[PDB]
Amino acid sequence: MTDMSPTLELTGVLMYLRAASSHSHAYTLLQMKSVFPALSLRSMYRNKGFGGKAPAIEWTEPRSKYKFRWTGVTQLHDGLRPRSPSMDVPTLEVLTKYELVDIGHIIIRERNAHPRHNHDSVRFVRDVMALTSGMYLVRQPTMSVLREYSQVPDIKDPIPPSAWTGPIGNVRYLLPSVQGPARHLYDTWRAAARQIAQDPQWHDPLNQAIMRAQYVTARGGSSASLKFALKVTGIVLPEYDDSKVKKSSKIYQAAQIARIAFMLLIAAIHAEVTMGIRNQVQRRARSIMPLNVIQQAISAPHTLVANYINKHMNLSTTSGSVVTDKVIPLILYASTPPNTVVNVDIKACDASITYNYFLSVICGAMHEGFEVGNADAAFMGVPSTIVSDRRSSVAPYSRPISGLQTMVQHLADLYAAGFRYSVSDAFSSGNKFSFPTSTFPSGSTATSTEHTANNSTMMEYFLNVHAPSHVKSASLKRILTDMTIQRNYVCQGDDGILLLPHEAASKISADDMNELLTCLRDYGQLFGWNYDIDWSDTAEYLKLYALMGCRIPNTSRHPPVGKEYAAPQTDEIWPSLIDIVIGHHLNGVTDVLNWREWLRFSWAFACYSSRGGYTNPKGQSFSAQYPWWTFVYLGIP
Amino acid sequence: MITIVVIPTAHFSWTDTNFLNSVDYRLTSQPKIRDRFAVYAPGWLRRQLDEFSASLTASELLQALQTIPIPVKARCLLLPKPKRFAQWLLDVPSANIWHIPVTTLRATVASKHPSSDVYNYIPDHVPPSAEFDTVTRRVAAGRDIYVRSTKVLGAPLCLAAPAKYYAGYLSTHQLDGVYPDNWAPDNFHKREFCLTILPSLLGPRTFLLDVDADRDASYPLSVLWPQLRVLALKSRLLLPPVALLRRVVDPGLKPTWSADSDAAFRALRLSRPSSASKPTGFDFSALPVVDIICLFESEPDDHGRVAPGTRLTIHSVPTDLLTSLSIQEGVRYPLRQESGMFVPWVLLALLMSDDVTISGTRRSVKLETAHASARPFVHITVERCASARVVDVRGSPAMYANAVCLTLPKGSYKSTIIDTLPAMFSDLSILEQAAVIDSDALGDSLRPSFETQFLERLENLDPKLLDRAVASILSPASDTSDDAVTTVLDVFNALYREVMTPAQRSRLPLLTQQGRVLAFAHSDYELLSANIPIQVVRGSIPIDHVVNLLARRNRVGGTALQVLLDYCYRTQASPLAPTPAGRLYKQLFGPWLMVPRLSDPLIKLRLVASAPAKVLRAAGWTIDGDPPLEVSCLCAYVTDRAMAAALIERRLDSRALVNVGGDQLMFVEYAPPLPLVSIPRTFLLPVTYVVHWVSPQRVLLNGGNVSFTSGLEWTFDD
Amino acid sequence: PPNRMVYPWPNQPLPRLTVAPTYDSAMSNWISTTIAFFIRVVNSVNMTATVNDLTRRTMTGVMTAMRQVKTMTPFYIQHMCPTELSVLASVTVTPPFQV
Amino acid sequence: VNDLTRRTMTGVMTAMRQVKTMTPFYIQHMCPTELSVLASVTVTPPFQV
Amino acid sequence: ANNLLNSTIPISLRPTILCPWFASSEDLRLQQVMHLVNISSNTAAALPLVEALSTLLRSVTPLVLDPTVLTNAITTISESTTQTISPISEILRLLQPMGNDYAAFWKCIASWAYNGLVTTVLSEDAFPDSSQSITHLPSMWKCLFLTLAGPMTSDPHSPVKVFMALANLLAQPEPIAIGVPGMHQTTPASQFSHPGVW
Amino acid sequence: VTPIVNPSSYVCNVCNARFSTMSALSEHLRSDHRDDASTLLATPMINNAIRSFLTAWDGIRILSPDVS
Amino acid sequence: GLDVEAVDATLLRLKILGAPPEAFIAVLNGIGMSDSEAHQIAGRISLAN
Amino acid sequence: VAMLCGQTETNLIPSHHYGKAFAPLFASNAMFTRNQRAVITREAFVCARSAVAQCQDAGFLVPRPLDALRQFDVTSAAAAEIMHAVNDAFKTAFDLDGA
Amino acid sequence: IGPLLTSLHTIPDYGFLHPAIENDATTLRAERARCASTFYKIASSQARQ
Amino acid sequence: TEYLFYDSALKARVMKGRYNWERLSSSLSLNVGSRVPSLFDVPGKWVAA
Ligand SMILES: [Zn+2]
Numbered sequence A: 001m002t003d004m005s006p007t008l009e010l011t012g013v014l015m016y017l018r019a020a021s022s023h024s025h026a027y028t029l030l031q032m033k034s035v036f037p038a039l040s041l042r043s044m045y046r047n048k049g050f051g052g053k054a055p056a057i058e059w060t061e062p063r064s065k066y067k068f069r070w071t072g073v074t075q076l077h078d079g080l081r082p083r084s085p086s087m088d089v090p091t092l093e094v095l096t097k098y099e100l101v102d103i104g105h106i107i108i109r110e111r112n113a114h115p116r117h118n119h120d121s122v123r124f125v126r127d128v129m130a131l132t133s134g135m136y137l138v139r140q141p142t143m144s145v146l147r148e149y150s151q152v153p154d155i156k157d158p159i160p161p162s163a164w165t166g167p168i169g170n171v172r173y174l175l176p177s178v179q180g181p182a183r184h185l186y187d188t189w190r191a192a193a194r195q196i197a198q199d200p201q202w203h204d205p206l207n208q209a210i211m212r213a214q215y216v217t218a219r220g221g222s223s224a225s226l227k228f229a230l231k232v233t234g235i236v237l238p239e240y241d242d243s244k245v246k247k248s249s250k251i252y253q254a255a256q257i258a259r260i261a262f263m264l265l266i267a268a269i270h271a272e273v274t275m276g277i278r279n280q281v282q283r284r285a286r287s288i289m290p291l292n293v294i295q296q297a298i299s300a301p302h303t304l305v306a307n308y309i310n311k312h313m314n315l316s317t318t319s320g321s322v323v324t325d326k327v328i329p330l331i332l333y334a335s336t337p338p339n340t341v342v343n344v345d346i347k348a349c350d351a352s353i354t355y356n357y358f359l360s361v362i363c364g365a366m367h368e369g370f371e372v373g374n375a376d377a378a379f380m381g382v383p384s385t386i387v388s389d390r391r392s393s394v395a396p397y398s399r400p401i402s403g404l405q406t407m408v409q410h411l412a413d414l415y416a417a418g419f420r421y422s423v424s425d426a427f428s429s430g431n432k433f434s435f436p437t438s439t440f441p442s443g444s445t446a447t448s449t450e451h452t453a454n455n456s457t458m459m460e461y462f463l464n465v466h467a468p469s470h471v472k473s474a475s476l477k478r479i480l481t482d483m484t485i486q487r488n489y490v491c492q493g494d495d496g497i498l499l500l501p502h503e504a505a506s507k508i509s510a511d512d513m514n515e516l517l518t519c520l521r522d523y524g525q526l527f528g529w530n531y532d533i534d535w536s537d538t539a540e541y542l543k544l545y546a547l548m549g550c551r552i553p554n555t556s557r558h559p560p561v562g563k564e565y566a567a568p569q570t571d572e573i574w575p576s577l578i579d580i581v582i583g584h585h586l587n588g589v590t591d592v593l594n595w596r597e598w599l600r601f602s603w604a605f606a607c608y609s610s611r612g613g614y615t616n617p618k619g620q621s622f623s624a625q626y627p628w629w630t631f632v633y634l635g636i637p
Numbered sequence B: 001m002i003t004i005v006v007i008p009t010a011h012f013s014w015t016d017t018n019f020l021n022s023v024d025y026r027l028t029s030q031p032k033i034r035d036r037f038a039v040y041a042p043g044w045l046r047r048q049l050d051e052f053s054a055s056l057t058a059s060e061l062l063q064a065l066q067t068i069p070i071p072v073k074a075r076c077l078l079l080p081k082p083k084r085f086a087q088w089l090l091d092v093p094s095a096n097i098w099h100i101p102v103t104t105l106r107a108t109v110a111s112k113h114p115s116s117d118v119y120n121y122i123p124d125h126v127p128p129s130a131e132f133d134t135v136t137r138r139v140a141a142g143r144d145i146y147v148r149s150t151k152v153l154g155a156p157l158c159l160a161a162p163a164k165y166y167a168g169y170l171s172t173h174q175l176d177g178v179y180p181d182n183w184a185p186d187n188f189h190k191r192e193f194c195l196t197i198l199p200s201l202l203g204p205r206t207f208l209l210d211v212d213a214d215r216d217a218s219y220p221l222s223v224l225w226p227q228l229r230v231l232a233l234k235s236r237l238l239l240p241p242v243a244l245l246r247r248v249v250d251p252g253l254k255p256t257w258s259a260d261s262d263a264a265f266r267a268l269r270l271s272r273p274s275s276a277s278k279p280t281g282f283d284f285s286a287l288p289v290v291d292i293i294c295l296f297e298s299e300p301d302d303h304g305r306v307a308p309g310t311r312l313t314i315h316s317v318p319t320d321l322l323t324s325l326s327i328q329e330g331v332r333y334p335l336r337q338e339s340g341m342f343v344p345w346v347l348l349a350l351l352m353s354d355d356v357t358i359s360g361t362r363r364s365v366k367l368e369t370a371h372a373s374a375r376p377f378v379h380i381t382v383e384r385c386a387s388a389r390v391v392d393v394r395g396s397p398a399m400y401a402n403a404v405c406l407t408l409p410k411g412s413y414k415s416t417i418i419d420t421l422p423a424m425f426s427d428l429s430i431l432e433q434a435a436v437i438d439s440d441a442l443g444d445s446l447r448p449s450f451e452t453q454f455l456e457r458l459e460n461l462d463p464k465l466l467d468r469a470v471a472s473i474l475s476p477a478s479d480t481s482d483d484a485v486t487t488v489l490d491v492f493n494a495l496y497r498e499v500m501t502p503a504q505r506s507r508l509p510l511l512t513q514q515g516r517v518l519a520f521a522h523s524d525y526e527l528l529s530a531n532i533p534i535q536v537v538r539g540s541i542p543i544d545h546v547v548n549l550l551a552r553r554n555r556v557g558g559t560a561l562q563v564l565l566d567y568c569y570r571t572q573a574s575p576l577a578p579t580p581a582g583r584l585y586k587q588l589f590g591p592w593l594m595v596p597r598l599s600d601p602l603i604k605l606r607l608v609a610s611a612p613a614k615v616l617r618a619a620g621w622t623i624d625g626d627p628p629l630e631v632s633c634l635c636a637y638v639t640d641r642a643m644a645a646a647l648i649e650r651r652l653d654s655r656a657l658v659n660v661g662g663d664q665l666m667f668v669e670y671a672p673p674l675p676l677v678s679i680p681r682t683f684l685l686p687v688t689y690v691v692h693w694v695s696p697q698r699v700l701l702n703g704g705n706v707s708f709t710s711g712l713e714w715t716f717d718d
Numbered sequence C: 001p002p003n004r005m006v007y008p009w010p011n012q013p014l015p016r017l018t019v020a021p022t023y024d025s026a027m028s029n030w031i032s033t034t035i036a037f038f039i040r041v042v043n044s045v046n047m048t049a050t051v052n053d054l055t056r057r058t059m060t061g062v063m064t065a066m067r068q069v070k071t072m073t074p075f076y077i078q079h080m081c082p083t084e085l086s087v088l089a090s091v092t093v094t095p096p097f098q099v
Numbered sequence D: 001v002n003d004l005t006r007r008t009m010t011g012v013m014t015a016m017r018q019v020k021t022m023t024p025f026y027i028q029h030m031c032p033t034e035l036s037v038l039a040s041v042t043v044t045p046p047f048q049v
Numbered sequence E: 001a002n003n004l005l006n007s008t009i010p011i012s013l014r015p016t017i018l019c020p021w022f023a024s025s026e027d028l029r030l031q032q033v034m035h036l037v038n039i040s041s042n043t044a045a046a047l048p049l050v051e052a053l054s055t056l057l058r059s060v061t062p063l064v065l066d067p068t069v070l071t072n073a074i075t076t077i078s079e080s081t082t083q084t085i086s087p088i089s090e091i092l093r094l095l096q097p098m099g100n101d102y103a104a105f106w107k108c109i110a111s112w113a114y115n116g117l118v119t120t121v122l123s124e125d126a127f128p129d130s131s132q133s134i135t136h137l138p139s140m141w142k143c144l145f146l147t148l149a150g151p152m153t154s155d156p157h158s159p160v161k162v163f164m165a166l167a168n169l170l171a172q173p174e175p176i177a178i179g180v181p182g183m184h185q186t187t188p189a190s191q192f193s194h195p196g197v198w
Numbered sequence F: 001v002t003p004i005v006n007p008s009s010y011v012c013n014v015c016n017a018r019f020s021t022m023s024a025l026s027e028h029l030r031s032d033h034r035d036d037a038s039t040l041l042a043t044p045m046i047n048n049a050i051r052s053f054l055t056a057w058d059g060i061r062i063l064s065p066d067v068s
Numbered sequence G: 001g002l003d004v005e006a007v008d009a010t011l012l013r014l015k016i017l018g019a020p021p022e023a024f025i026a027v028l029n030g031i032g033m034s035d036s037e038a039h040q041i042a043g044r045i046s047l048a049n
Numbered sequence H: 001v002a003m004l005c006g007q008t009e010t011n012l013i014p015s016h017h018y019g020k021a022f023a024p025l026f027a028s029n030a031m032f033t034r035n036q037r038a039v040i041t042r043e044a045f046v047c048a049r050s051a052v053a054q055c056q057d058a059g060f061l062v063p064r065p066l067d068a069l070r071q072f073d074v075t076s077a078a079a080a081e082i083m084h085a086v087n088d089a090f091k092t093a094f095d096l097d098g099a
Numbered sequence I: 001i002g003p004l005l006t007s008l009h010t011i012p013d014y015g016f017l018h019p020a021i022e023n024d025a026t027t028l029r030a031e032r033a034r035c036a037s038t039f040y041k042i043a044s045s046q047a048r049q
Numbered sequence J: 001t002e003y004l005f006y007d008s009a010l011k012a013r014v015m016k017g018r019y020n021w022e023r024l025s026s027s028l029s030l031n032v033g034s035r036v037p038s039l040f041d042v043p044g045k046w047v048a049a
Helices: A006-021 A025-031 A035-040 A088-097 A101-111 A119-129 A141-148 A181-197 A205-214 A223-232 A250-257 A262-269 A293-298 A300-311 A314-318 A324-334 A355-369 A403-417 A445-470 A474-480 A510-526 A576-590 A595-609 A629-634 B019-023 B043-055 B058-065 B082-091 B102-110 B132-139 B172-177 B222-235 B241-245 B319-324 B344-352 B414-425 B441-445 B450-458 B463-474 B482-505 B508-512 B545-549 B560-572 B581-593 B613-618 B641-646 C026-042 C053-068 C073-079 C081-088 D003-018 D023-029 D031-039 E025-037 E043-059 E068-075 E087-093 E103-113 E137-152 E158-169 F022-031 F044-056 G004-017 G021-029 G035-044 H014-022 H029-055 H076-094 I019-027 I031-047 J009-029 J039-048
Strands: A052-059 A068-076 A164-167 A172-174 A276-278 A286-288 A341-345 A385-389 A397-401 A419-423 A433-437 A489-492 A495-499 A539-541 A544-547 A550-552 A611-615 A621-625 B002-005 B076-078 B145-147 B157-159 B193-196 B206-209 B286-298 B310-318 B356-358 B377-392 B403-407 B517-521 B535-538 B603-606 B609-611 B629-632 B635-638 B656-660 B699-701 B706-710
Touching: A006 A025, A006 A101, A035 A088, A035 A101, A035 A119, A052 A324, A068 A324, A088 A101, A101 A119, A119 A544, A119 A550, A141 A276, A141 A419, A172 A181, A172 A355, A181 A300, A181 A355, A181 A445, A181 E043, A205 J009, A223 A250, A223 A262, A250 A293, A262 A293, A262 A403, A262 B043, A293 A300, A293 A403, A300 A314, A300 A355, A300 A403, A300 A445, A314 A324, A314 A445, A314 A489, A324 A495, A324 A539, A324 A544, A324 A550, A341 A539, A355 A403, A385 A403, A385 B222, A397 A403, A397 B222, A445 A474, A445 A489, A445 A495, A445 A510, A474 A510, A495 A539, A576 A595, A576 A629, A595 A611, B019 B193, B019 B377, B058 B132, B058 B222, B082 B102, B132 B145, B206 B222, B222 H029, B241 B377, B286 B319, B286 B581, B310 B319, B310 B344, B310 B377, B310 B581, B319 B344, B319 B581, B344 B414, B344 B581, B403 B508, B403 B581, B414 B581, B441 B450, B441 B482, B450 B482, B450 B560, B463 B482, B463 B560, B463 F044, B482 B560, B508 B517, B545 B560, B603 B641, B609 B613, B609 B656, B609 B706, B613 B706, B635 B641, C026 C053, C026 C073, C026 E137, C053 E068, C053 E087, C073 C081, C081 E043, C081 E103, C081 H014, D023 D031, E025 H029, E043 E103, E068 E087, E068 G035, E087 E137, E087 G035, E137 E158, F022 F044, G004 G021, G021 G035, G021 J009, H029 H076, I019 I031, J009 J039
Parallel strands: B002 B193, B002 B206, B076 B145, B076 B157, B403 B517, B403 B535
Antiparallel strands: A052 A068, A164 A172, A276 A286, A341 A495, A385 A397, A419 A433, A489 A495, A539 A544, A544 A550, A611 A621, B286 B310, B286 B377, B310 B356, B603 B635, B609 B629, B656 B706
């Protein structure tokens, strides 16, 4: 379909054969995964005969709107050629381990035939990058959960215990005398909490309906834990089994809760949470950690503050997700010759956010930030309560606190206790168990808000404070200043993009870049964030790839044959295959393949799918098939 | 009839037979005393408050409630929907006491949209378009009220009509909730005093009871406490609990006209002569405790005179601890042991207490117990009991019968409570020392001990840097002193992460999967970093540990390594509000302390889990007899065989995942965790327990390791 | 000076009998003149050269409608709001602090 | 600089001006004594213009 | 209570009463100053005061805000449906009720009580862009709203900001003089926040 | 059983020195036991730091303007 | 649960059909919009914008 | 919108409505707490100033009966410690809560 | 995978897991039975992707 | 519905809107059976899902 030279296919065959020869075919492939993109995408135009035409893209003044304008083309020349070092040496060194140096030599030699940027060059890049294995790797869930959540961040300068005030029942406020990034983080969250505090947008009954309704979906989990915990506290929940609906559905548990006074349920938030696993194509499998409805309700302030931080600082860095295509022009602009871009992403944001360093600060800031407000004002059915204040050793006492603060009091307690998951993998045999971890749930988009907020905050402090105080190059200081996140940085969850101000008709010395990148790594190391940065004059953001303003579809991430299945059984009926075909065909259009040949293959797939049958558990069989005109209506020419 | 308004304290016992006891149990000591009090505080009102709590501000709620008379004579009479309700006036024509026209009634029966006309013009009808205060205003009139909603406040809510009209209009649990109100009333009596949870206008005949403790955070009316207290304060209306015992009420301590020297005042004389053959042969969830004021004195001068001394307040020490030790008021006991340490019983009192403060003010102090202070105390005298009340213990600090880990700073006196206390009895099974886990165990497990390895790495640094670090840690004003301390911290963190974590993770079943484990740790991080499913309680003791460990000289380190480790652990510990460790101790040992006070013998129990012989033989085990083997998971104690048997028919919804190796190391795991509150409060559990075969002679040879699953069933034993 | 408060608008003592919308308050006067001015702006030559008169006719219409709404706020500001402030000044935990 | 920033900057500067510090006193009345004695014992005598 | 809730006492002997409930103004003045010393002089100090007072105001008030009559009086205006722009829609797109029941109005009122501590200013975003012309209808409507809402704020610079807001739109046909150098008629109006730049 | 009579004398663990008053014993532990330069870090200076900390302890003051 | 794309389609369809304003009011009130905001929203509906 | 959409009930008497609304506010002594706290504030303030001055040499304008007694250190640190001592003393004696 | 296979009655050439192995892993919780079962399950699952 | 309609104002709004709608749609004779998005059907959608 991609119409590549047989030589490249030859390399891929040797690639697979070498992997298959050794033990653990999956593991062997996984180790040498990034070899192809590094050999081709990361190093293309590091030579002399450089040139061609490139897009001229302009970013409009209200950069928050993410509006871009195509405004002509730019001639390419040697002064514009990429500055970063190539990737040949590390890749070849790795390939020597598996005695596949021939593959590198073949690829490099073939690559050297494209000194100038044009259709042929990018087409070559597309084809070679399409060689990575497209298999959905799967491993035992028990090993997966044991290997991922067994990590704890390493903080290089922990907050000393003497940096906190007296307790407020559960939380501690941060002493004013403390400075550094933690102080920056504390102030930011506190300021946002203040803005949330007084806001008649809530207590609007319609808005309250939105939040409660947002918590219910067809899927769900942890229902068994819910029923146990409430039955434990003497709460007799209703049941509706005759209404044939799954108990574990978040809908089912929500219906049981409807009548109960909310405060009675408070003891149930400290309950077990089930888990699930979704496999991936080029990485470890993802995790799905659905909280119960009550826990999801309690964590509301955390989400609300995070949303305000996002929507009112860097405009959520596209996390509004209105149409995903807004990132397309962004990376195209970011990859143009006049601009220098750096790809960054937290190594494991889910595993690095934790209570001992991060969440404690946030909880304290939020609890303090909510002090501005009526101490007696119930929120979402959570009434105000009396808590003991022990900030003054000479004059301790107790005072009321608003419902928001009560939520924080419990929320901090839960975070400090750590999440308690229960694994029940079906592929393994009779081995269910439970173990706690500090790993944040991060099962869906609801987590992107918190991580994006913290991501932006730390980056901003690094740019404006830490880096100028610590870097050496005067030229770097000159260019590092006059730079701010709202027009130089975007992110979503762990992923992030940093782009430098246009160096005047020139490019920054790689020496300064190395100095800059090194300091950033150390800065992340301070509070236990492995930044995993790279600089190759390309654009990786939300799994999209751009080179010199041209988008590169990474076809390997959409294997023609591969499809994820997270259960031992496919558990589906024949007609569903049609929708699979339709979705399959569209990818071959989204990714630009040979449109004539792709269409031919698609129809063949449709023909096989057009027919099917079924048999009763004991009785009759049934059969049917569609006339081919159906697929025309479904969208196949 | 003087009224005393009462706001419950932090762990107020509610299911108690008498609300009165949780206030101050001394009031129950004498018949001549207990006959002077009424209580009121009805349950129906309690439930209403539980609901409305989430919908009214404190000021509004106080403003609404304050006008209600003591015995609520009114009722809320719910009306059924008009189509249903209209039929009632014709099912009994005389019930049409408003005489709504028959034509209108059957017009309503005919209409697709029966209007509110049947409600219209009915006197004192409360539509859903009404507010809380509307009800309360009518409550002061004493007459019953007719309402169109269940969410009402101030009076018991009962159906106006038979249930047939409300059925379909309402559902089962809703139709159930009104049953006590359907026959609500009970009389209220004119004794000298009447306590009440209902607020009221503070005045010459109404008083606010002051207990000097934090409110019940869960109790919905605790938010009123500040406003009530300040109003009472500005008019001198607070009553200390002791005032209630006097023949005539007055706010004050040490009055002229009374010496307050009587058996009624002495809370240490807890007595239980009466009986009723009730199922609670004992309620081991209810624990009586006391707040006491104790005077401390140093050695006399060269002429036999002595300094004025100082008096401190100890909070919520369990009373049975003192009684069982024959402690008596007004006796100057010796405080110091032969080696200068505290006498054991004092240490127990401190450990199980909640807090220690200066008697007058409200400043909490951490007491020293070493040779640090000059003119140190040598004598102690308990002077009076500021308060004496029963408190609920069930599942308060800890939640699961499986295990619990308590974190304490290094240098605590955990050894005393775990050894001396059971040794002081050594006649009734309290615990098994093989089940308690010393916090130092894993550090001792490494072939070179974790301390030795840390020392060996540490000495590589320059001595001056180490010296600077130690001095900085001791000197409180030495803020940060980054260089010296941070370097040491890096070594500590690097080593601990490197060696301790895998070693800890390798002991997972030992910590949790035994019968019942009590464990100690230096920081919650020690467990969280290893993913050990055990509840962790961040405790604290009201004694200075730093000085305490400074007296322990026989260690690997010369008292300097100890303080270094102490600081490292404290730095490693997560920032959170820690709780008093005494509460956990009260939950564990408290019930046992009440054993000697009992009059009748105990009865043993257990919840053995079966084991099919097939898997045992299949695993190479040699076993006699076909019947499935069974293993005791946890033993319990009761004293009323009747109710105990009556409660034994419940089928616990918690399976057991039994695992045992060939070396007979046996382990248990409950797939649904077993919560303590699920245990009926008449039971009694040992602090720790070890799972074991009920009949070891059944087996004849241990084959390979074995695992299996089975249900759980409480059963007697002989 | 003690027991006195300043007020950005003119004020009056509390009315005696029932209230009603009025049109001589300071705020009402400010509203009317403001609307009158903008209407004059819309009819200025600058708009005529570019704005179709039909739309211009509409715009002056809607502005006219706003000027004729019998709102209660201007009366409330001049006569009733000061009383509410004067009372509440004795209730808030922090007394008023003005310049 | 809007008004809010203008006051904010002003508050910072005046705060810096108001805080007590003994450094100026040490310079004017104590530091010369320390320099005088130290110069008498250091192996390299002071070199001044 | 401004002589509302008039009440009186009985006339009989009250022998031994004592109600120590009062103090001089100097005491109150001293306490007020002390209270102002124990706060962070940023917005964190002011916000609870304004919020509390605003809540009290909204708690007790006979006034009810209801835009139904205004919209009803606006939507009844007849216009051709064959045009490409309907200014009615432009208006109604503005005046969007954010559902907060107009917290700004009560917020402005409360701010007056503490004008000596905190000042309310018009938000910068709620300005017409200086690049626009008077014929750009949304800009014109914005300027109208600023003019109407001007007096309700406590900012001393609000009148100038209002005046410059229109001056920006008329920089092309109607020029005027700006005193301080470095400022032009197209400067964003929100920047005129200094008495010397009038 | 709980003691009811104060000790006639007080004993240190290793020095075998008996004291008529616990205060005298306290001083002996406070001073004489604490030089012991025998380990990898038992330096005299830290002994002074410990000694100073011991003497400076007071945790039962009503007023504490130093820490306030 | 409800679909915005269904809501606006119905509203525009009503507007093209020339339904009386109360029809819009009922539809808007059917999804929780209060009468005042319902009128405010209903007025915005136009074929031009 | 607020100033253009204000309305009230038709037959409204302000006096009755305000009176009925303000009744619950002035119902207790709570409206007088600030007076008492202010009084204590004054006495605490004066005593603190007096104490700090007496330890100094001829500070402010206070009488100095104890001047015969020696007081060598007069540094600001000593003054701060004295002021804290007085502040703690008053808070203890009268059981104050806030700053 | 071979040694862990029986034969199917429908297609005799291909096979599936021994019923004995899964039974023992289920009932007896036998180690080698469980290990074989787990290996068979995941190996099959990987092919199913 | 109870979980959805925690308060009463929303329920009153939706009920009024639905009642007016069907009354208008039939009387004005636009049509009958128009499945208009409304909150009363949101629980129905949840149940079906
Ligand atoms: Zn000795």
